[PDB]
Amino acid sequence: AAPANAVTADDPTAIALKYNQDATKSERVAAARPGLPPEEQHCANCQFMQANVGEGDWKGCQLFPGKLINVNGWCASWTLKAG
């Protein structure tokens, strides 16, 4: 059960970025974002995930202010966590 502030499928930004809460049900292969092979990409290893926001598998994403994403999700803004 997703948190009350989870990013949802008719969120305009979620559509535009092709977010899914489950990276295995994402188009990460098609986008081929750089820095890791696409099958290795998910929110937990993304620069925009906020480790200090949320709880458990439901963490912040800088791009989705006021909400939570799933650590096992993905969107087309995926960028390697570099620091």
Ligand code: SF4
């Ligand atoms: S920007 Fe990164 S952390 Fe935020 S939803 Fe997309 S992949 Fe997940």
